[PDB]
Amino acid sequence: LDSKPASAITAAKNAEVLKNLPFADREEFEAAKRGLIAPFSGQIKNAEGQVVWDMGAYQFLNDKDAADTVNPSLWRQAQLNNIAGLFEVMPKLYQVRGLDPANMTIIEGDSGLVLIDTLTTAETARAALDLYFQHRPKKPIVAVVYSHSHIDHFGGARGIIDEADVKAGKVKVFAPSGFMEHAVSENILAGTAMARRGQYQSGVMVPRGAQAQVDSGLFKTTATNATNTLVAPNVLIEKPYERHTVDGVELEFQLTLGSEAPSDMNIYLPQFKVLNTADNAPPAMHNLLTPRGAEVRDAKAWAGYIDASLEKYGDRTDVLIQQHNWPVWGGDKVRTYLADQRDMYAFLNNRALNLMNKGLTLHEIAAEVSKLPGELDRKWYLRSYYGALSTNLRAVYQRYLGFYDGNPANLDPFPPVEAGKRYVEAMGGADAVLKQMRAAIDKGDYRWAVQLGNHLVFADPANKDARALQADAMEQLGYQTENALWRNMYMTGAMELRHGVPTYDSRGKSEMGRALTPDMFFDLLAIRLDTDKAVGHDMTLNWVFEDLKQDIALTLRNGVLTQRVGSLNPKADVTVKLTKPTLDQIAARKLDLPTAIKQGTVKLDGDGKKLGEFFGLLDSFSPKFNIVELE
Amino acid sequence: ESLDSKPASAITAAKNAEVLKNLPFADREEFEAAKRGLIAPFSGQIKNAEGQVVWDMGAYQFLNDKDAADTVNPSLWRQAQLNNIAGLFEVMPKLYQVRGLDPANMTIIEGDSGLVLIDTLTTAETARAALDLYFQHRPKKPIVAVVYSHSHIDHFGGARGIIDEADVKAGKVKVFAPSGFMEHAVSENILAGTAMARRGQYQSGVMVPRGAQAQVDSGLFKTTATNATNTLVAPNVLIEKPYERHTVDGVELEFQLTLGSEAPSDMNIYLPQFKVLNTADNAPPAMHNLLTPRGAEVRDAKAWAGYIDASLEKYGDRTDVLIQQHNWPVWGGDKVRTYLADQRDMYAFLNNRALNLMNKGLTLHEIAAEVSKLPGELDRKWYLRSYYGALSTNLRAVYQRYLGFYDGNPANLDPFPPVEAGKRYVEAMGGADAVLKQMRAAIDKGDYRWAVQLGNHLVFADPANKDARALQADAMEQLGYQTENALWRNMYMTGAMELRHGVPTYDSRGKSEMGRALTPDMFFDLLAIRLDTDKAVGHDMTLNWVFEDLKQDIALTLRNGVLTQRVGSLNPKADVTVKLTKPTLDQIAARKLDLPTAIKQGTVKLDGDGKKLGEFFGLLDSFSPKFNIVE
Ligand SMILES: [Zn+2]
Ligand SMILES: [Zn+2]
Ligand SMILES: [Zn+2]
Ligand SMILES: [Zn+2]
């Protein structure tokens, strides 16, 4: 069950990467170290004193070369991602990088500060701003820009600003069209599955070191034991291009909806001749299908938004900045970078669509492609460190055709545990599959080894020999892969196969749900509702929010909850009069239902018994289910 | 080893007879609702200009006033029988419907002077035949207005067979359509086309004969129209508001936009004068697809349920008979209200139950195995059965839509392609003969599902094994005899045929002039897909295109074997400039007119390096929609 070292094959495969890849090009090291005002190599702690962010854990990477247990290209990116701290881009324009998965852009301006993004957590947002104030003059925050609907960009808002100031208009908070709908839907409805699957993407439960967690492509790792916030925006960007001025700072926003995020945009600074591309063009291939789980992205639209940014800003930009990683300097280097980025995404879309039309299936296309075309294979900033070329090609297939390959044999597949049992039987039995698994590792075919091991582990997760072997093979795949996310996944996989899921959650301190409208909260309840127990409990529940002047009519039929915003059922079984702050207290589980009834904060008309009944049919989700085993 | 269509096995016949009990059959409400209003039946053929059969109802005679064969699921046979009720039908005086003369229905509203039509069927020949049958029983009048319910070919396809675009452009004929119709009618139906068209052959069962041992029904219709012409006549008046009231020829029409549900450009049509509601394809008497088997982008079940519910609230109390553009009407306010609420609940369940199980850690296939039935009273409704859409497929689809093809388990991070996996598995299972003995055991046992999984591995490892092919075809055929789903029956059957024989020679979209309506940008996106990256590498160039008749300039760029474009732009340093018109571009696209022939003619004038155009066109691949699916 111990962490096995590099096999003969693995070590040879990694040494091969040393040649046939740049390494002699240090342009990225130059671009990352440039502008460094104050480094960061320490820890960021929570209120309870627990570690949130630790850079000191990645010391093994500093000014050294790759171990046999880590792909050299991954090591290169790992080393770059270690360049943390406060950085000047231009006078009045700074950036805090490496104090969180994302970056915070700090624009000076007339009276206060204009911020682009608020990091992932309140503790990191606060620490980034603390490091900035230690070297720059202390001023308030007049404006905030949410580049897009991702938690690493809005998550730390409440740690540095107040909702009260936003609602009053004292602080101007900009966001692209459809932000609220997306910030809450992609991150909470599908939330608990996303948050647990995201643990494989992060490698958070995996220790740091050359035999374990080393990097996450666009950052080191995810923030631990911290608080995630959601402060509703003030001003929404609805036009394809919108110019705005705040505190003597000119901002041109370019809507990039549906590319890296559903609600997304770029921010050009005409006064500074700098372009900020959010996460639309980072120095690694991005995902078209994120491993934590999400809606597929449109590579065609992504390439078109990069190109539209090249045409509109390319001739007007001296330095390109991002919300992940280092800036690219000089108009010519920015123009090459943009065109390469554009080309990479159009290739993913166009080549896949080409091969689909030739009759190739998702996996067939992943095997056929293997490399980016022409000069795209020699660029460090186009490598498969975050997104994967195989995954992305499969994703374009999913997006245009779907999971189903067209072959009727794959029309109704068997679930993991069921397929695993019949395959193990077909393969000769548990011992036979184990001998075959051992042969595959000896050969160095760890890819085939993991396919056998998955069938056995699901057929019987008790087979401790099958588990240890599949973990050993996965570990070797982790030692081999250039992809940081693939490394974090295989590693999280190998650990849990050997041991299991412990006792932890970072989204536990996260009060994301407080920002939610009744309709958003009821959509959560329609998802939380347990169809099996809810069957035969049909009812209608009117809800009236006096503070909101909003009426909502719920209906529970056939164990399915549906709602009508702005309506009231005339023959409703129960009527629930309350306020949003009281609903929030019951949602946060601070205030109890009968406690609220007695208090007077929840007044009921009709069959009052039906509310408690309804709440008794609501499941609770734990984000610690089995992934490599059997829930 | 035999290649003939095997009859029902002992197990299959027993499994089908079991469906007789545990499913209604004693409820004939649908037979009453289909036979009601029958003015004139239709049981004959509709022919093309060349005299070839387009639509044949006489082929489904084996279904009429008889009970199910052992070789067809009794529920599927029930729907098959209903879909045989073809002809002209009165709904109310001045309100008729032509059903069964095409995959879709045509609603004929009388009115003051002429006729107001809702939809124009799939083909010009069917549109003409429907209108012919109507005029044989009703007074001969012009067509004053046409309504396109949504952007699907079975709804606009036959417009040019009964109306003239000259009359539309003049405003003599009012043609209504929901917001974004043109963009969608042309984009979703002409893009990733060749893969879609070939995969659609499995969905259709067009190459499969008719009969109790082969093709019987297509859920929402009998089959697709053959050897016919598909048309596109641009709409006059666009519905842009969520609800729009319009009056034409003394006919009141209230339109409700249902954008993004069953179709991207979609709507319902209420008839305030008649107290009738027309739901297009938004709520048919079968489960619809969230992911169509021919391949497409996933649909939003949440939005779909919301539009059904909005139609229930707005029209439910004002509607006596609900009509549709596929299948029979539902009569009586109470039966319509129950139908709508069941439909709404079915879609919300798909979305909500899947999201529930995803958050509990269940994977796409695990959720398909756990669900099995719709909740409460939804399992006892004939109109909610899996005849078109499938409950398993749709649950898997909701997983794909919110999370994607990848289950989170790293063992499935990089799966082996079909032929590669098949070889390794067959080897692991003992070899070709061993897998064949195991396959034979699975059929004898009646586990045809497991049999097809083994057979797929063998057929892909060696498609020469004629015994493996015949066996997998035999097991698929039994799955087809067993399935309630009409599309699954068409697929397994197409599968069994090609495994035994192979792919023939045919095309119905050959008489269809749909691709003529393509804008230059749409045509260039096709070229970016047709471009062969491998040969195009090292042929970097820029090509300006100018369309005098369109007053539109488009700037192409070929870099690293990737083609990108900018609509409304012109590259100042372009290698070549191509001045032409859309009708001339169309001629070169249709391959009727040649490139140097056009240059000499004067129809294509060139500036700069004229050599680069011919060079560019030489790098373009050609796709054939007759690739192997099961091989
Ligand atoms: Zn992002
Ligand atoms: Zn980010
Ligand atoms: Zn349709
Ligand atoms: Zn239709």
Curated annotation (Swiss-Prot), chain A:
- Keywords of the record: Hydrolase, Metal-binding, Signal, Zinc
Subunit comment for this entry? Homodimer.
- Known catalysed reaction(s)? an (R)-secondary-alkyl sulfate + H2O = an (S)-secondary-alcohol + sulfate
**Family annotation (InterPro entries):** Alkyl/aryl-sulf_dimr_sf, Alkyl_sulf_C, Alkyl_sulf_dimr, Bact_Alkyl/Aryl-Sulfatase, Bds1/SdsA1_MBL-fold, Metallo-B-lactamas, RibonucZ/Hydroxyglut_hydro, SCP2_sterol-bd_dom_sf
Q: What else is known?
A: Is a very useful inverting alkylsulfatase for the deracemisation of rac-sec-alcohols via enzymatic hydrolysis of their corresponding sulfate esters, which furnishes homochiral products.
Keyword presence, Metal-binding: yes
Sequence positions that bind Zn(2+) 2 = 152-153, 279, 324
Q: What is the lineage of its organism?
A: Bacteria, Pseudomonadati, Pseudomonadota, Gammaproteobacteria, Pseudomonadales
Residues that bind sulfate = 201, 287-292, 297, 386
An MF annotation (GO) of this entry: linear primary-alkylsulfatase activity
Q: Name one GO biological process term.
A: dodecyl sulfate metabolic process
Detail the relationship between temperature and activity: Is very stable at 20-30 degrees Celsius.
User: What are the EC numbers?
Assistant: 3.1.6.19
One Pfam family assigned to this protein is: Alkyl_sulf_C
Tell me the residue numbers annotated for binding Zn(2+) 1. Answer: 148, 150, 260, 279
Report the protein's function.
Answer: Alkylsulfatase that catalyzes the enantioselective hydrolysis of secondary-alkylsulfates with strict inversion of configuration, leading to the formation of homochiral (S)-configurated alcohols and nonreacted sulfate esters. The substrate spectrum includes a range of linear, branched or cyclic sec-alkylsulfates. Can use sec-alkylsulfate esters bearing aromatic, olefinic and acetylenic moieties. Acts by cleaving the C-O bond, resulting in inversion at the carbon.
Q: What is this protein called?
A: (R)-specific secondary-alkylsulfatase
Record-stated family: Belongs to the metallo-beta-lactamase superfamily. Type III sulfatase family.
